[model samples]
Target chain A: MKKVKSLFLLVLGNTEISTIPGISVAGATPELTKITPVADAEYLFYEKPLTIDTIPVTPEGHPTPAIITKAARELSNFPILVVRGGTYLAPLIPHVHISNVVGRDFRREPALPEVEVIIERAKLLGKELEKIANEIVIGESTPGGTTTAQAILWALGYENPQELKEKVIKEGFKRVGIEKGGLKDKPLEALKEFGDPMIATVLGLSLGFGGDVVLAGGTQMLAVSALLKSLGEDLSRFMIATTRWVVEDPSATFIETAREIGIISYVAELDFSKSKFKGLRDYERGYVKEGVGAGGATWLAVKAGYSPEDVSKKVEELYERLMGLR
Target chain B: MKKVKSLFLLVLGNTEISTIPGISVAGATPELTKITPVADAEYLFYEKPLTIDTIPVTPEGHPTPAIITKAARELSNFPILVVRGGTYLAPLIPHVHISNVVGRDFRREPALPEVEVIIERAKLLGKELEKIANEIVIGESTPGGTTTAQAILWALGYENPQELKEKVIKEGFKRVGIEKGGLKDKPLEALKEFGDPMIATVLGLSLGFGGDVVLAGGTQMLAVSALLKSLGEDLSRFMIATTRWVVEDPSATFIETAREIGIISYVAELDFSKSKFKGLRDYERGYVKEGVGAGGATWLAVKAGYSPEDVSKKVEELYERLMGLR
Candidate 1:
């Protein structure tokens, strides 16, 4: 085999489930969730977010994980492609257009009405990327995606998920006529009923690309891995790259679920405790543990010889500039 | 620096000039031009176009050059990516989304009002490709694109272009307030005034990809080459790969313009004279000589040890199947 060439792909998606109060923390307000993915994509390319004036933040002021992705990219100079898996608004930049069908709330309707089409479209992109790259690091930005991830995992029979209230999950399960493990053997059916665009797109990409794939996220990627495994894909070539915060978080079973799915995992030991700003320091407290492939990008940078400390320091420098500081 | 990995990129674009009668022969009728680019793209991935049941053909039934491109890909297995530079409809497959702004007729308005944005977007894609590919072969599908190419060539001072009536050219030049060679040092200004999305996209891609580029087309590539030259880009690493028919067309100065632009050239020696179908055989008669990267794809196939005869035979086989004859 030829020497491996790696490419970073940022898949952007949106779900109306984010708008449900207390469902997602990706944006400062529930309505801001609509623009969070767009902002995340824009922030990766430009100095600041173009969709909105400010960078995406939790209501408590934690910075978006895009800072870590940006830091890794600047240090490694790895090529990055922005893909619009599905979005409420297209990012103000060039992207691979898989679909524009956002994930609807499952309680009212099928979460992703066009899951098959989106996956097929993404598969085509994956086939193309397969030629140019021997390894692909796939990351994603989708607000309220964790809830969707939890639902997919639950449907796939993985217990101990972190999410919306019991009533919300119960209603969604009733709407889809599925219980835990009911759709375990039917991956596409599970995705269509409960998956968001990010999960569907990532699943399709992983399926089509016959190379080493680094699924870059926290809990959301477990759902993707489960789908891949259920579809009969070997897990030996797949690895989940996430942050240490997610690995140690008490709210979700990130490590156990990955083990259950038979996929290896990598945790980026990024430390922001010495950051000059409180928002950057909050990363240590597990706020915004991972998104936008923060860990996978760091994995790439480290493979290129940089350390987690390098990425963390770079993130601090970037956050300072983004905040109009030194 | 590294061994060359060639990738074929098919850029799909459209122009209002194609809807003008007697200007384009890419579709059966002027109105069919609207779906021509989309169908050309869909045909590359599927047995037949999904957007339209039938593949695009000349008014007299000459097949689209996509057959040659398809044949080359089937034989060589080089990876291909479809890019939507600008189109009336998106293809039924995945594509890099750049813009949806179709080129208007320069006689009535600026041909490509969003020329700058399109170029910038394509450049981002180019930068990404530069990482994974050592050389990129760029081909395009744009109905009525030849006229836009001629207009851009005339604006850049390329004498002797084949196109619309003298009156139509005169009116277009008048609307843009440009005479032949009027925008010699102003490439973007000329593109905005008279160029189409295909030219802008190819130009941006060539500019951004800092490696070897195979410009795959006929006279339209002369416009792209001229724009790149005016933008002060070195032409040492660029080569125009086209068929012998286009190189020998009496109506256009393909060889002369390329020589003047200082880019090298390659001619695919594909012969279809002994084909069973008149549609395929007419390629020798200068019908649909090159589009959809036919020549460049053949160049890649040839580089991969397949002879021009190999591609020609494959094309005949593909045509037979496409016609339901085999």
Candidate 2:
């Protein structure tokens, strides 16, 4: 009955938004943009700075729960947490009620092991999530989370890779370089070897968060849901938040997966010119499937009771401010 | 570009809404309460009625394709087809393009082979769906679709059923039933044996229809989405069309599943009490899981581009004229 007021945004992977056109340090610079001053929400930038090389690489098992617990506490004090940026073995923190801010890339060199760590982390994170928040919103920000999401989904027992491929288009998997060439391997194995750290975090968060949790990234979230399903876990609490671009993208597989999973998911596009992220967009168009978390973040804000128009307005304002548009 | 018109409504299994309170034979009839008179939608009710013997005594391997085909063809003429009612088999119809009216009851039965006949029917039904509709919209009506949905999701491979249960609760799965007794089955086995006929239809439909389908029912749609992920299918195009009751119901699982899958799907609700069928409210209360193509039929009209509010108004007008709803 208490008006759900607590909100947490956990920046899960790669806090370096330097390449995201309008999100670069110069664009968001306080002196030039002053964008951060206008926002009323609590923002915690988790510069975990941990990369695939930083985390312990365990092929036989999952990461230690203590590491996840440490990350969980370091992130925020709010009952609800939103993770943004940086790859952890299992990006999701244990028991602290967290969501990802980055998408998972499951095709990287250490993808499978990293994903395994995330899965183990998800278990630990699930335990931690059960303790703090009544509801946990999980989101991500991995540049290549979408493709990894697809790969993870394939590994979890989904027979149709084509459908998953279509989802990655709009959800942000391509930015990370996931491709059909790598899809033949089981998604789980792929995750263990090449999956992104963010995906693992989302999975851990979903598992650890015993209550309602929103997954804010597109492809990353889709893959997480697929993994949850494959692992035989109920991912009812997980939600995918993204944009119209992701939803309408014919090549992405997230939409179909979202529909099938029945997650409280929706898209909120940035609506910027593809020219802005020409390199990123080209990568997505040619080989990469999609990016991670931008659209998903918008969805989480809306689901928490923000009106679509209001959220749209906020995003437009932010985009204009960053892009020097009147 | 042709301005898609006249969606198809595929009614599956027993639509009898007799068990619920508000649903009277006259007021809650499928034709009177479910279909939108002005949506220009085509209606296809399953030719086979629910036989009591079939419900309680049919052998697991009874050929159900013949019956599924009968239902699929009835609603096969449009770009989009909505399937309603009953449980058949999920794996058999792995590639059909239709949404489910109900989800499988995972507690009562598990294993696709247990319902071999239903699976066979689903396979044939999936193939048939591909011939006509470009996309399939699913809604379900089995008495325990939500529970079965959970079970089927588990069989498909969701590792965390508890989290799913919570998400389902947030989406309204518990409003109907979520008792400990309901959770008694080993998720996989229960789905194979007692899963609703509607869930099976959705599995087949999505497989055949690909991932661009719409999902009509509320909780049932969400549950199926969860199961679909386990099966590794993309479900972004799938949407949920139901009544406000589902959204408000703490046990509803649709929102949660929708969130997990991503935001490319739709969520629309009907005014249950005002429906011509007195059973709408009762169905919300957990007495019935199916009502012919009630949810799917209404959804078909809306997805063809009818405004949700307008569709509701038209249905109300028709109900008033048909059942004397003052």
Tens-place lDDT per residue, model 1, A59-111, is 88888899899999999988888989998998988788899898988888889
State the weakest 10-residue window (summed lDDT) of model 2 chain A: A33-42
DockQ, candidate 1, comes to 0.58
Error of 1 at B202 (Å): 0.9
Q: Positional deviation of A259 in candidate 2, in angstroms?
A: 3.4
User: How high is each candidate's TM-score?
Assistant: 0.97, 0.32
Lowest lDDT sum, 10 consecutive residues, model 1 chain A, at A160-169
Tell me the spans in candidate 1 whose CA falls farther than 4 Å from its real position.
A1-4, A160-163, A323-326, B1-4, B160-163, B323-326
lDDT of each: 0.87, 0.40
Ten-residue segment with the worst summed lDDT in candidate 1 chain B? B160-169
